[PDB]
Amino acid sequence: TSYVGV
Amino acid sequence: TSYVGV
Amino acid sequence: TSYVGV
Amino acid sequence: TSYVGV
Amino acid sequence: TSYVGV
Amino acid sequence: TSYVGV
Amino acid sequence: TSYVGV
Amino acid sequence: TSYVGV
Amino acid sequence: TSYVGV
Amino acid sequence: TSYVGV
Amino acid sequence: TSYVGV
Amino acid sequence: TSYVGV
Amino acid sequence: TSYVGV
Amino acid sequence: TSYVGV
Amino acid sequence: TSYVGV
Amino acid sequence: TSYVGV
Amino acid sequence: TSYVGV
Amino acid sequence: TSYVGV
Amino acid sequence: TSYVGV
Amino acid sequence: TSYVGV
Amino acid sequence: TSYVGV
Amino acid sequence: TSYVGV
Amino acid sequence: TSYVGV
Amino acid sequence: TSYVGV
Amino acid sequence: TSYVGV
Amino acid sequence: TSYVGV
Amino acid sequence: TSYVGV
Amino acid sequence: TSYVGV
Amino acid sequence: TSYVGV
Amino acid sequence: TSYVGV
Amino acid sequence: TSYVGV
Amino acid sequence: TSYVGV
Amino acid sequence: TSYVGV
Amino acid sequence: TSYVGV
Amino acid sequence: TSYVGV
Amino acid sequence: TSYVGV
């Protein structure tokens, strides 16, 4: 899964 | 803002 | 599932 | 605002 | 189910 | 306002 | 069921 | 106002 | 059943 | 005003 | 049954 | 059902 | 049933 | 004025 | 004014 | 269902 | 004004 | 569902 | 203004 | 889903 | 403004 | 997915 | 501004 | 911002 | 994926 | 998986 | 500005 | 910024 | 992958 | 795997 | 500016 | 900047 | 791979 | 594997 | 400026 | 800068 700003 | 699975 | 700002 | 499954 | 602002 | 299942 | 503002 | 099942 | 303002 | 089942 | 303002 | 100003 | 101003 | 089901 | 289902 | 100003 | 499903 | 200003 | 799914 | 200004 | 998936 | 200004 | 996948 | 799997 | 200004 | 800024 | 994969 | 697997 | 200014 | 700035 | 793989 | 496997 | 200014 | 600036 | 593999 | 296997 993609994670941005985590 | 955080974005997961987008 | 997608999660934004969580 | 948070958005889940949208 | 979708959840916004919860 | 919160929105669930909309 | 949908829930708004609950 | 709250709205459920509408 | 629908519920508004309850 | 509250509205149920309308 | 419908209920308004109860 | 439609709801306006409720 | 329709409801106006209730 | 409020309008429901109109 | 709020509008739901219109 | 559509929701405006809720 | 907020608009959902419009 | 679309969400504007929520 | 925020726009989701538009 | 697209997200603008979230 | 941020733009995701546009 | 594309991300601009995130 | 940052640009990813554009 | 951090980006994972994008 | 391309990344500009990240 | 790709990792940027982690 | 930095450019990766462009 | 660090880049792994890009 | 190409990297400029990284 | 490639590693830049790690 | 640095250029790699260009 | 360090570059490994690029 | 080519490297300029690294 | 290639190593630059390590 | 340094040039490698150009 | 050091270069190994380039």
Swiss-Prot record, chains A, B, C, D, E, F, G, H, I, J, K, L, M, N, O, P, Q, R, S, T, U, V, W, X, Y, Z, AA, AB, AC, AD, AE, AF, AG, AH, AI, AJ:
Query: Where in the cell?
Result: Cell membrane; Secreted, Cell wall
What family is this protein classified in?
Belongs to the ALS family.
State its role: Cell surface adhesion protein which mediates both yeast-to-host tissue adherence and yeast aggregation. Plays an important role in the pathogenesis of C.albicans infections. Forms amyloid structures, essential for cell-cell association and cell-substrate adhesion to polystyrene.
Species of origin reads Candida albicans (Yeast)
Q: Which residues of the full protein are shown?
A: 369 to 374 of 1419
Description of how the protein assembles with itself and partners: Forms homodimers through the tandem repeats. Aggregates in amyloid-like structures, with self-propagating secondary-structure changes, amyloid-characteristic dye binding, and induced birefringence.
What's the domain of life for this entry?
Eukaryota
- After translation, how is this protein modified? N-glycosylated and O-glycosylated. The GPI-anchor is attached to the protein in the endoplasmic reticulum and serves to target the protein to the cell surface. There, the glucosamine-inositol phospholipid moiety is cleaved off and the GPI-modified mannoprotein is covalently attached via its lipidless GPI glycan remnant to the 1,6-beta-glucan of the outer cell wall layer.
The protein's name is Agglutinin-like protein 5
The domain section of the record reads: Each ALS protein has a similar three-domain structure, including a N-ter domain of 433-436 amino acids that is 55-90 percent identical across the family and which mediates adherence to various materials; a central domain of variable numbers of tandemly repeated copies of a 36 amino acid motif; and a C-ter domain that is relatively variable in length and sequence across the family.
